[PDB]
Amino acid sequence: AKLHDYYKDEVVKKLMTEFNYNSVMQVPRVEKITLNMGVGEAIADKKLLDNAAADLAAISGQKPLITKARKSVAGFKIRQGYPIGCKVTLRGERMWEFFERLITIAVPRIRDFRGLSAKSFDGRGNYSMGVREQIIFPEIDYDKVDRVRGLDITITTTAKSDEEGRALLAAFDFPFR
Amino acid sequence: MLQPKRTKFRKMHKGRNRGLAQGTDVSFGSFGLKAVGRGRLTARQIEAARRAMTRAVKRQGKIWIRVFPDKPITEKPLAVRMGKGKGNVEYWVALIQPGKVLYEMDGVPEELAREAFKLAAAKLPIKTTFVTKTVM
Amino acid sequence: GIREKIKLVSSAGTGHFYTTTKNKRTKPEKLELKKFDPVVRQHVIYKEAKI
Amino acid sequence: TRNGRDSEAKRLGVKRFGGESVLAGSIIVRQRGTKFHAGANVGCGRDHTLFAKADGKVKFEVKGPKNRKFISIEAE
Amino acid sequence: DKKSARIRRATRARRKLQELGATRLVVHRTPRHIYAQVIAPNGSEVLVAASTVEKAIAEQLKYTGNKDAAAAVGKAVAERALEKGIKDVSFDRSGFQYHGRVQALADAAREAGLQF
Amino acid sequence: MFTINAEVRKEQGKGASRRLRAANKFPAIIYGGKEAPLAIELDHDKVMNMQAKAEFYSEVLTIVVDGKEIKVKAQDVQRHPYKPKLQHIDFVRA
Amino acid sequence: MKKDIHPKYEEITASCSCGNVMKIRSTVGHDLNLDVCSKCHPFFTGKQGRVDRFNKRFNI
RNA sequence: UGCCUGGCGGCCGUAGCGCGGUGGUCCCACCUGACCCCAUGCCGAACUCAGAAGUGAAACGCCGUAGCGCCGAUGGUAGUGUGGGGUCUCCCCAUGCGAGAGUAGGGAACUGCCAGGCA
RNA sequence: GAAGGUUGGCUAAUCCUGGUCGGACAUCAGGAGGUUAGUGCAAUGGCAUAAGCCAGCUUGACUGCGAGCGUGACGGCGCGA
RNA sequence: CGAAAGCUAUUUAGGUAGCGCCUCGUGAAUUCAUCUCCGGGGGUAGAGCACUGUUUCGGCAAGGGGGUCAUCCCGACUUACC
Ligand SMILES: [Mg+2]
Ligand SMILES: [Mg+2]
Ligand SMILES: [Mg+2]
Ligand SMILES: [Mg+2]
Ligand SMILES: [Mg+2]
Ligand SMILES: [Mg+2]
Ligand SMILES: [Mg+2]
Ligand SMILES: [Mg+2]
Ligand SMILES: [Mg+2]
Ligand SMILES: [Mg+2]
């Protein structure tokens, strides 16, 4: 990774002396990144999930997992076990490289970009964000886009509180408005 | 006219009515009407007594009904023979054992409560007495 | 009851057979199991046949 | 009447009580599920019948972190 | 939780061994060490033990938490058991997968003489 | 201020207790501290009158058993289901 | 990671308009040429009234 | 022979939660790295392997502390076998058995084998 | 014909907080909770060592017998090392 | 000496069959019964309300059904309210 080097060098020290931490593992870490795609339009055409999954593979660089309806839901014509989404869990080198890609190419490519909310913390130091469109990523080609599919991005951390989560995500200059 | 909003079963075994009551203390107000006898209190009886006492106190104070008629009573129609299955649920009753506080009242003087409860008792098929809340 | 009776016939030439049932609508492929043939006293392939 | 049906009684229950001397194979309890569990020298059948695997005396006991009732055979 | 999950994995085999009255060769693994105990059928008496926390074993080893260390522990526990005339145990992987260090220990105990 | 005269019970159980109550007496118990509990009989009417007043249930009382003064507080009372009668009283040593 | 199931994830090059070059692993195959990066966008660097409107046309 | 720790058990809440504190020589834990043995219906998260720079943050252990859980008399009450009785839809008497609930109170487990570190 | 055998693994309902389309309710992340889920089909008794969930390999859904026992007036039916 | 009017099955139900209960004979174990002591399972009486349901009162009330306002999306704004 490249941003793990930045974490280990700068972010730990700055957060240590900002939060009066006893031990270096009391400092929040970024432990995993999860990217999913709600592709319930698969109900109509399976080909959809396949194309959404290939988009996700292009974005993330690892093959996604096809996720299934946990139940049968009468409001969307889905049975228990019908595939309606994808997911990739990135940890380590791949998640750090994705963090840099998203921070330094992807988010500048969002229409009308004016910062990401800092109230989007789940309550325990985990941040989630959406991506109306996928072209925001340079890994997806434009003159071939079959459909306009967004995605969700969640950053699970060891930060016990939203404050410690913002603090860590800010050390990387995460664009918070 | 009290009866359960719903029940898991429509019809109940007749059962018996032995023993002494639970709920022998004035637990919510200062005065109570306690059953001395044993028997059944129908929902119509409970309602008639309630109306009587409530009218007596001119809808002042507060009244608690401690008993609830959750027992369905079936009857066989006129001119039907025996057998051919259990009769139809006709009314709802509460089983009463001696000692059961039936009603309670607060927010009125003892004398007015006594007269309201006397008028109420006139509607009931079981012998009763007036009781006052105790320290313990 | 739509499952139909079938027999599993020994491949050892003994003529020994087992019997079972089968949903032919959902599973048309011929059933094939290794079962004990008591005539030759060995486990051999058994194959579906009509009852 | 919509009612009027039942099933034959299944004669479940304990067949040999605590302290009784039994032979191997003797059924100790017939049951639905493992109301009682098999202990030492006792086996559990496909219908959860508990039977003696050795000659001996029937012994009921409660053990384990779930306070479950086990049936064992103490050899003679 | 890692340890509670491993204990739940171990329980069924351990209960089976208990009801079989089998003398148990129970193995414990940590990232730094590996242990072996021959436990009597009553479950509360250790007949023979060997581990990488002992110096007679750790001294002759480079690192105490690799497959060679596990092989040394298995050989040691097996010869100690055979000097006791034990000669037939059942293996209890304690919920660890039968693989790597645990497998090396078991194989060493087998080729050294223990029967399982 | 409430003094109660009591006698140590000669027999216990259902029959004994009912006979006590048929003779205008009722059983009671004193417990608390390291001493063993003391089972006593009380005259029903005097105690009934005493406990009509609510200071009976909040001040320290004194029971005299063969002349020995024991200071207590009323801890629980068992009342007759519908008659103005007392069935049993618990007294905690104070 | 597993074998032969993943997109070809090779290190590429990516050059911004303001002269920013980042050596990035991604699954595109070719190199990257992008208009705006994290270091030349209005929000990242912090670049994101009726009396005046009335008085712009209202020189008294 | 004492203190700490690891494993396997006895026992199955007086033993479990909560709250607070506390420990890293050893042990344990997190941890470090991973093409490899092996693994991911994706991900070295888990499982696995090769290690020992860092840390007791988390977990875990231990210590303390009743806000709970849990245990729990004595006495009375309820029921009840046998005999007898009444005003007999229900009770009472003699005798034997005698709860549940609640009250006082108890309570922050106890313990065997083996191994390791310190004294 | 796996929804059977076995080996290895796993653990539920519901609610709350955050998140593209996406809503009361889909998929993702965290927390609460602790089986209030689940069981091919009634109800009951069971079930975490799971009997509940997933996967690999498979045919013991074997053949001859059977100490002993349960349950039936009997014909019989059942459990079994 | 001494029943039965029960169980199971039956075109069976006021018949009949096997079993149960009577009688006569033969054979055989401390074989059987009562009491005392010991070892057992239990979920009835009673009780209770954690569970499945039912129930009333108080507190805190997700919240909804009706009238205000505001009104494009909104918001405030009461409840007899429930
Ligand atoms: Mg009596
Ligand atoms: Mg690791
Ligand atoms: Mg700590
Ligand atoms: Mg008790
Ligand atoms: Mg504690
Ligand atoms: Mg399994
Ligand atoms: Mg199975
Ligand atoms: Mg005679
Ligand atoms: Mg006839
Ligand atoms: Mg009852």
Domains of chain F as residue ranges with CATH: 1-94 (2.40.240.10)
For residue B39, what are the β-bridge partners? B96
Determine whether E63 is exposed, middle or buried from the number of CB atoms within 10 Å of its CB (0-12, 13-18, 19+). exposed
Instruction: Let me know: does A131 contact A151? Beta carbons within 8 Å.
Output: yes
What distance lies between CA B7 and its chain's CA centroid? Answer: 19
Domain assignment of residue B72, yes or no: yes
Instruction: Let me know: does G43 contact A114? Beta carbons within 8 Å.
Output: yes
CA quadruple B96, B101, B106, B109: dihedral sign = positive
DSSP-derived 3-state class of residue A12: helix
Domain assignment of residue B15, yes or no: no
DSSP-derived 3-state class of residue B38: coil
The experimental technique used to determine this model is cryo-EM
**What residue numbers bound the domain in which B102 lies?**
21-136
**Which residue's CA lies closest to nucleotide J47 at its C1' atom?**
B22
In order of B46, B129, F86, the CA distances from B98 in angstroms are: 16, 11, 16
Q: How far is B78 from chain F (nearest CA, A)?
A: 40
What the block records as the tokens of D65 is: 């972190």
Neighboring chain B residues of F79 at a CB cutoff of 8 Å: 24, 134
B13 in contact with nucleic chain J (CB within 7 A):
no
Name the class of domain E1-116. alpha beta
Q: ∠ at Cα B103 (B100, B107), nearest 5°?
A: 140
DSSP-derived 3-state class of residue D22: strand
Span A3-172: which CATH code?
A: 3.30.1440.10
Gap between the Cα atoms of B94 and B97, Å rounded: 10
What the block records as the tokens of E109 is: 């105990």
Total count of domains within chain C: 1
Domain assignment of residue B49, yes or no: yes
Neighboring chain A residues of G6 at a CB cutoff of 8 Å: 57, 61-63
Determine whether D51 is exposed, middle or buried from the number of CB atoms within 10 Å of its CB (0-12, 13-18, 19+). buried
Element (H, E) at E20: helix E2-20
CATH number at B35 reads: 3.90.1170.10
What is the bridge-based pairing of β-strands F68-79 and F86-93?
A: antiparallel
Gap between the Cα atoms of A27 and C13, Å rounded: 76
Q: How far is the CA of B85 from the C1' of I64 (A)?
A: 56
DSSP assignments along A119-144, one per residue: S-B-SSS-EEEE-S-STTSTTS-STT
